[PDB]
Design a protein around this nucleic acid. Structure first.
Length: 114
RNA sequence: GGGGAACUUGAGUGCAGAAGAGGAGAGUGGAAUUCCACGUGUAGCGGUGAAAUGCGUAGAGAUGUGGAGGAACACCAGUGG
């Protein structure tokens, strides 16, 4: 194939990266536990460095070149996929910070020390 | 203190304005959470000081559309009303 977009979710634990179609259909995906970062090493920028490259190898298997990266969530891997996937020979076109922003939503859980 | 009579600053009324998340009522949306239907897609995601229980080859998580349903009403937001 030729074109697709790239979803990245970089939470406090995981850096989950999927390469999907432009109209939302998956091709390849990986994360830190997919490579073998077993513990709480999953949030490191080295983990998103390794995880984005392995998913991009499945894109070369399907030959798509153009990307469209949507960053979702607070973490550390939002810079690493820019460092990885641009160096992966793939065309990074647009970068969004689409965190799903609630207006008020539902009430969050308690603070961790109450 | 009581009675009789006046004055208009106290307080009130008219009139002319201006501000407002003041209350009560019936209705209205918009993101977001989950739930479920399904496509696409594979080995884990989930979580911590560390890790496990829980969830997962019966196809999760991520992702695309669609559906129900509730409650909360970002931005404006300010020793601001």
């Amino acid at each position: 194939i030729e074109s697709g977009i790239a979803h990245i979710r970089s939470t406090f634990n995981n850096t989950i990266v999927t390469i999907t179609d432009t109209h939302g259909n998956a091709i390849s995906w990986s994360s830190a536990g997919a490579l073998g970062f077993r513990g709480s090493r999953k949030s490191t920028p080295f983990a998103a460095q390794m995880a984005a490259e392995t998913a991009a190898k499945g894109s070369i298997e399907h030959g798509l070149k153009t990307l469209e990266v949507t960053v979702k969530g607070p973490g550390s891997g939002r810079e690493a996929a820019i460092r990885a996937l641009q160096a992966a020979g793939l065309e990074v076109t647009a970068i969004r910070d689409v965190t799903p922003v609630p207006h008020n939503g539902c009430r969050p859980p308690k603070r961790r020390r109450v």
